[PDB]
A paper describes a structure:
Transient Receptor Potential Mucolipin 1 ([name]) is a Ca2+-permeable, non-selective, lysosomal cation channel ubiquitously expressed in mammalian cells. [name] plays critical roles in many important cellular activities including lipid accumulation, signaling transduction, lysosome trafficking, and autophagy. The loss-of-function mutations in [name] directly cause the lysosomal storage disorder mucolipidosis type IV (MLIV), a neurodegenerative disease characterized by abnormal neurodevelopment, retinal degeneration, and iron-deficiency anemia. [name] can be allosterically regulated by various ligands including natural lipids and small synthetic molecules and the channel undergoes a global movement propagated from ligand-induced local conformational changes upon activation.
A key interaction coupled to the S4 bending movement is the insertion of Tyr404 side chain into a pocket surrounded by S1, S3, and S4 helices where its aromatic ring is sandwiched between the side chains of Leu66 and Arg403. To test this, we replaced Tyr404 with tryptophan and alanine, respectively, and measured the effect of these mutations on channel activity. As illustrated in the electrophysiological recordings using whole-cell patches, the [name] mutant elicits large inward-rectifying currents without any ligands, indicating that [name] is a gain-of-function (GOF) mutant. To reveal the structural basis underlying the channel activation of the [name] mutant, we determined its structure in the absence of any ligands to 2.86 Å resolution. As expected, the [name] mutant adopts an open conformation with a structure almost identical to other ligand-activated open [name], consistent with its GOF property. Like Tyr404 in the wide-type open [name], the side chain of W404 in the mutant is inserted into the pocket surrounded by S1, S3, and S4 helices and sandwiched between Leu66 and Arg403. However, the larger indole ring of Trp404 provides a better spatial fitting into the pocket than the phenol ring of Tyr404 and several surrounding residues (Lys65, Gln69, and Leu358) provide extra van der Waals contacts to the Trp404 side chain. Thus, by enhancing the stability of the aromatic side chain inside the pocket, [name] mutation facilitates the bending of S4 which in turn propagates to the pore through the S4-S5 linker and activates the channel. The [name] mutant structure demonstrates that the sidechain packing in the pocket is essential for stabilizing the open channel and the lack of such packing capacity in the Y404A mutant with a small side-chain likely destabilizes the open conformation, yielding a loss-of-function channel. The [name] GOF mutant mimics a ligand-activated channel, yet its mutation site is remote from the pore domain and the channel can still be allosterically inhibited by small molecule antagonists (ML-SI1 and ML-SI3).
Numbering used by the authors:
A (entry chain A), B (entry chain B), C (entry chain C), D (entry chain D): 40 to 200, 216 to 527
The structure:
Amino acid sequence: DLRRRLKYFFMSPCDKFRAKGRKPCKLMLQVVKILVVTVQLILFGLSNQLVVTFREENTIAFRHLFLLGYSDGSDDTFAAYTQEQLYQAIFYAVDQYLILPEISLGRYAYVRGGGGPWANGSALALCQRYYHRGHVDPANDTFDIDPRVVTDCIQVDPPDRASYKNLTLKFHKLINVTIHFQLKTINLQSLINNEIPDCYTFSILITFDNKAHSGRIPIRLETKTHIQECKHPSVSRHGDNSFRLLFDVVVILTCSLSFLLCARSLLRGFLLQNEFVVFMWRRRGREISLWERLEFVNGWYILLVTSDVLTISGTVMKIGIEAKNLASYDVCSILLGTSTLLVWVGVIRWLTFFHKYNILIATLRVALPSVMRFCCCVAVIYLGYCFCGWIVLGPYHVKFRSLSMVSECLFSLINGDDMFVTFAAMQAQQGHSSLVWLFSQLYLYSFISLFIYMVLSLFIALITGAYDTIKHP
Amino acid sequence: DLRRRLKYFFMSPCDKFRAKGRKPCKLMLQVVKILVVTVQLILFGLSNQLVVTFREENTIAFRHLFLLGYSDGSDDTFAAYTQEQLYQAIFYAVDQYLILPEISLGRYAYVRGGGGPWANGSALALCQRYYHRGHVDPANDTFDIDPRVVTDCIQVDPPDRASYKNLTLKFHKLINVTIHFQLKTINLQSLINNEIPDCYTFSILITFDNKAHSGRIPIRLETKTHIQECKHPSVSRHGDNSFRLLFDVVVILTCSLSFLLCARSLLRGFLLQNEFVVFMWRRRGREISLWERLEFVNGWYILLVTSDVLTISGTVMKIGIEAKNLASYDVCSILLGTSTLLVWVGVIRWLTFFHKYNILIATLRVALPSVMRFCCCVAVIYLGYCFCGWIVLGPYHVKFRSLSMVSECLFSLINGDDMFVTFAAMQAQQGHSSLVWLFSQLYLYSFISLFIYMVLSLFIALITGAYDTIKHP
Amino acid sequence: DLRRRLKYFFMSPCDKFRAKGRKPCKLMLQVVKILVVTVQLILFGLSNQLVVTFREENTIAFRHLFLLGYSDGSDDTFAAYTQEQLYQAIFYAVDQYLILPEISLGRYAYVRGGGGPWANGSALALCQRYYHRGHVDPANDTFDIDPRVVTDCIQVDPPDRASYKNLTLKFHKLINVTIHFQLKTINLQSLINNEIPDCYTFSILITFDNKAHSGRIPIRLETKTHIQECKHPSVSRHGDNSFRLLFDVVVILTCSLSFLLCARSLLRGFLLQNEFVVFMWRRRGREISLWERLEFVNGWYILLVTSDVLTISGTVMKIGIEAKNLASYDVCSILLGTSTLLVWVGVIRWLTFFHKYNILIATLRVALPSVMRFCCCVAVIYLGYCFCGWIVLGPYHVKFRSLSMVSECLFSLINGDDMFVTFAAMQAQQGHSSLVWLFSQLYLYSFISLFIYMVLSLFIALITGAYDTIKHP
Amino acid sequence: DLRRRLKYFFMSPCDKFRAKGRKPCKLMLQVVKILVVTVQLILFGLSNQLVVTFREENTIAFRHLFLLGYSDGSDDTFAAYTQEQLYQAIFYAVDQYLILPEISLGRYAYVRGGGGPWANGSALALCQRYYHRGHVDPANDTFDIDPRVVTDCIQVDPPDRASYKNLTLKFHKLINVTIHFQLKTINLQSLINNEIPDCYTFSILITFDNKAHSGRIPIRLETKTHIQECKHPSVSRHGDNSFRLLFDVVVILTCSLSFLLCARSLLRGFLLQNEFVVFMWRRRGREISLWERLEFVNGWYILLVTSDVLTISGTVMKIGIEAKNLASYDVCSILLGTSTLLVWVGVIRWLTFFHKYNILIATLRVALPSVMRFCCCVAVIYLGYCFCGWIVLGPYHVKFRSLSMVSECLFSLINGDDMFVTFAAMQAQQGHSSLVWLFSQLYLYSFISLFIYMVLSLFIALITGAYDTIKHP
Ligand SMILES: *[C@@H]1O[C@H](CO)[C@@H](O[C@@H]2O[C@H](CO)[C@@H](O)[C@H](O)[C@H]2NC(C)=O)[C@H](O)[C@H]1NC(C)=O
Ligand SMILES: *[C@@H]1O[C@H](CO)[C@@H](O[C@@H]2O[C@H](CO)[C@@H](O)[C@H](O)[C@H]2NC(C)=O)[C@H](O)[C@H]1NC(C)=O
Ligand SMILES: *[C@@H]1O[C@H](CO)[C@@H](O[C@@H]2O[C@H](CO)[C@@H](O)[C@H](O)[C@H]2NC(C)=O)[C@H](O)[C@H]1NC(C)=O
Ligand SMILES: *[C@@H]1O[C@H](CO)[C@@H](O[C@@H]2O[C@H](CO)[C@@H](O)[C@H](O)[C@H]2NC(C)=O)[C@H](O)[C@H]1NC(C)=O
């Protein structure tokens, strides 16, 4: 006698409108949510882009100001090869630091006291770390090394408007040289979006790295950015961001309404599932129910609930960022982008009621079991290839340096991408061992053949077979 | 009794020739049109290439003449990093401008009076734009900024055969520095195609951009080209372009004849459609007709009519360009190229009568409904991925800078192109946040899997199923 | 009664051996031919590589010796931008020419008298070509140009052990500057293959190209190489090339024997075809024969005859090259490589008798008719796209410069290669017209969709359908 | 009566546990082996990476110390073009060698006595090799060459704390100039993994190569590394590598146990095969057995035996390396990586008992016969294309230099990778012969069409047909 109720619970919004006159509130709510969430993501991306751009541009400016003879595009090859070059680089960094206000285009401030843990209240720390004792005498094939690391720190202070020139580097046992300092600045470009510029404290660490002890000392500059509210900010306020706050409260309201409607649908689905279970337990036997329960739960509405929870969390983080309580642009950006993707995907719920528009979703729901079973056997081969290539070809091949990079290289190879570059990276140097080159040939040829021609063909065949299963309604 | 008439309206030109002795006028007219339109496109492309080459080469010469230390291939990285560098760059630009006739290889003319809106009748304008007041004191974590933009303009004039050296830049609140001037020249290379060279006025704007306020000021040069007839041109006229005008009048005549014949075919198709409708309304019931009307209309002839309208418009624009009434080479080039593509495609009309030669068109006409239904579900996923990647990975990934660039990157990824470059762009910098790098990994892996392995397989399966439907006639 | 004869003419060499005891002479002859022809190709490639390397390395050395400030990898961007730069480049070329024996690493000789047609018996010709009269006054928007080309030649002579410094360039009407000279040298590296080094005369032409009249004069160096026998060569002859001549006479003998055997097989096939025709004309009606004739002709043996004719021609050209009667390494290399490919392909004749090993050939012979019918419709779309992209995007896109380059770009795009590079070439410059950029977007997206997703799918489907037709024997 | 025994020998570990209560010892042993072998591979890769990094970084430092004007990324284009440049390069190398301890960042030692075979007990050998007599007079088109190679050696010795400046190069007959010396150093970075640093002797050979005699002398530096134990090593020993030795003995024990269990399974399989053979010989006729023997042998257990033999060999080589008896990191790395890949693959043995998880293996075992039969015909075409492209396009195309490179290029082309780069390499230079360019067009187009569109389609069709054969259990 509830068979028509079950029919009502499982028909399209058009059918529900024709039957009980129920307007598709959730469909139009989802469309509105797509609009507002995408707009909110773009609006947040404006300020996110300003923050990232400020950090990256300041880092590039620091590299040009403090690294001697630095040119763009040579970060990986920037190195010193003679003692004079290393001394000149270190001294150039410190001298440019001392004359920074006179030369720099940006308005940078000396963070007096902040020069790292090695600093004893000074602004810049020029540290050399070497072995406790290192008697490297390769001529006699004798060395006497105490692996304990001693650090000699020269503390440099900007004038309020010298010593570091007496640096004596112990090249035979030098582990590294580092320069730590901090710089304050204000991100004025925030004003283009009617925000209040913040204070950015850049912790700059310049490393002259001798850990390889190979006659070549790479030189690198790194910055850690700390963003905080300005203590005394004064702006004439030629506008505001009411357009931001409107789209934020609208997003919150739409997501809360979606949460309520979807939770109500989950609850009624549970109630109808229990009603069906008891009806079939009185009619048929007991413990009959095994999967009808999961047929009752709407996974699309679970997705909508999760996505709007994510959107609410991202909006709250965004609002806190504009309130400047927290400044974590990466996490907020990830939350908002993931929520935007999920709200765009969630509108496919209403495309399921039509088999002509449900080819992708139905094929997926039919193929995923077989796809996972196939991937169980595929994954062990893939992981064995990953580890073998990472350790054997890692030292020699630029695309096999790290496990993640090896995975990316192999995954791209499965799709026939950068094959000749992968071969030529080994070809250009013969691996400095003909054996390693021959192994690379065998490894790459076998992997490409087995995964493009064999594994991928079967994967596509499984997906096409699922589609063939669901071709006719 | 009209059944043989309907047969006559729906048979091939060979059948029409065998039945009523009708020569295939439209077929041979289309072949002639292909020839003449392609030749006209190439002939126009000669002068179009001369114009584009002149503009691009003059811009490169300007960049080498006015940008200090400029080298090719470094447009994006060209920047100043110290106050001395910025002053030297600005002064070098102005000095090279002042000595241009003495140094430049091209015969450039000073456009006296034209120096932009900021110019008060002078030829060159050296403008600095800064905040109305900017008290950036990052040391005290205090700033006082009035976001109103004040512009100080130095007006520089070439001698008829100094002041700008007293420029005082306010680096703490400088928004940008700009140099505007104009240069006249004559595109003499036009003579190689028996055309009269025109006057090109290049509006050159050099921007030293400090809007980021990040210690790094990018330096760029842009030109806006204005092409106009020379006031007093004198050429000894060693030839003409009657070969151009012949192929232009022939194109116009062929396109008009095609328009007439196709319009006549559309009219007779409409008349026969109405005759069939009334015959079946007297024989069968009423309102019977629903799609036979669209079976009567020949879409190929609609395409031919549209394409020859486009060709006539492009030819008229071309003729006006040679007459120098209008100089809009981009629009004319687009019109002529689109018309050439459409006239080449239109010759497929006569390949439809043969099922062995109609595999592509018939498969398309069968698959497009299902393809569009599938793309309705595919497009929301694609757009969600586009927006998410554009906002989250845009600041970090060079291939995600803009929405169009994100779309191109994702579309290329669907075809397994530049996968490892996309992965390595994030890998090389770790996203400056391990979280963002992990998100990029998840984003790229999920997108590539879902679209290459799943979505694309289904798309190809739909097309192949349509082909299977039409495999046998 | 001849039915067993026809059976004998159409069975495998193993069947022929089991029936009439006929050894497979042609199969082993083909294997021997593969060996000897491949070895001969490699042996010729040694000397071919020496010749090409000598030409390329001499050209690079010339570019470094005669082009001021030249660096490798900047051939396309090498240009002059000021009058002083152009004068310095020209004078540097001439001065380096005059002091060549003192500075150059190679032993170059001055070709006294050979300086081009513009030379009046002098070794170097410094020519400037300009308009007969050119009164370019862009300031008054007036020009007076006589398009006749006047050439002023300065004749420079190396000392037997000045004037050219008085060059006055007419920049306002200069078409180009050229430097022609010739240099003799001896390719001593030939001795590593026991050959006699030849005399190479390099005709060097340095062009300062002002045909664009755009303030930027590209500078390029080209060499034309003439190889001829040395007049008085003296080598102590530490070996010979009997190993070459043995493999050349063996190739000639094997190819002639293959030609004889295949011609005999063609003749007997013709005789049996005529015998079958007359037998079926006496048995059945007349004019019965239509295709059995082409079933009788063995296309594989026609291929073998053509390939061994090519191999004989290539071997004769090779022998003439070692005899130094003719020195045309490119034509001989093309002939020998094409013959090597054809002899490797010809061994597939004997793989046809087995259906398990004949999948590729049988599928081809079944699919080529349908493939050509499909390509008839595909080719018009491809050509329309080619012409449209070549003329519209040619000026702007680096991959659309020429029709062959456009074809290569589109063909690579069909296979999903360099998609993002094609998009980004337009993206990086916005086409200098938003309209052209939008057209490029539409053009590329439509082409890629239609050819990868639609056309290629149908092509693969046709090939797979042919395979399905021949899946079972 | 043994039918249940045969059933027992051919059921899954779960079935064996349910029947006879046999725990799956080999499955858990294989999982443990995967863990321990992968961990051992990573642990060895740490030290392998240190060794390779030390060699590569020392080579880069040597190139920067001894090559005049050297910059990274220009190894292939590094060359001298004038006599002064060559003299300056040679003298700079020798002078930098003489002042190495004063300038170099690394602690290098002079290997007194070791300067190559050309050295008469001196540390550095500056050798020039030229012809016995070479009277190259290209002006008179006459040369007199004795191909015997004379070597003039200047012996340079570092001071214990000049002559080589009198070098007179015979450029007209110079074959090459070489500088041989040796340098000792200690790889201190080994201490980061609690190893004892070794002594590395680098044999440095700098070649100024004039074998082309083309005015351009490439300059290259090569190092051969010899690693040996330090004679008197002293380290305070802040730790050990018991974590390494534990995982090495565990690997040895696990591999030996796997070897024993798999050998026992092979033996019982042989015994049951013989028992079945005799039972069916008493029941049915004789010589009945033909393939049941190979159905009895478990190929997976053969793979496991081979893989654990490889793992034991690699572990023994590793232990010897830490013991410093032998220092062959490449061979040990290859062994350990191959064993890791094989142990990861071997866990697929237990996935065969389930048809849903055995799609890949079953398809392979069904498709490999047909795949090999197809590849028999494919390989001759591929090899003919390889040889033809290698010899004809090798001199001109950068991707066709060597046979292995040609194979990689063609294999990548089969997968639609670097197509436009392959076309553009010929396009950029027109092959310096329009004929060669046209041949390259025909060659590349024909190869790509035939292998992507035709050969690859058939290959995928064969694999898919095998899958279709095994789709249902
Ligand atoms: C310079 O070398 C020292 C000595 O190796 C490094 O100090 C180590 O730093 C890491 C991370 O900061 C710590 O986990 C270790 O405990 C430190 N000591 C040792 C002995 O490893 C230091 O990191 C190096 N500096 C740079 C910038 O690389
Ligand atoms: C230099 O900076 C000024 C100040 O921001 C820019 O002026 C703006 O220009 C745009 C477009 O020309 C206008 O829409 C705005 O109204 C202007 N004012 C402001 C406050 O934005 C100017 O464009 C910059 N110059 C360059 C070359 O980038
Ligand atoms: C320098 O400019 C002159 C003038 O344009 C060029 O001379 C032409 O050369 C081509 C081919 O050599 C001939 O077909 C023409 O008849 C010549 N005259 C004209 C008016 O075109 C000359 O080729 C240019 N030199 C270089 C190296 O480009
Ligand atoms: C410098 O040139 C000499 C002369 O050609 C080369 O000497 C040959 O070296 C190879 C391998 O070392 C030997 O097989 C030959 O027998 C040597 N002589 C000849 C005549 O070939 C020498 O290898 C060259 N040096 C370098 C570094 O290339």
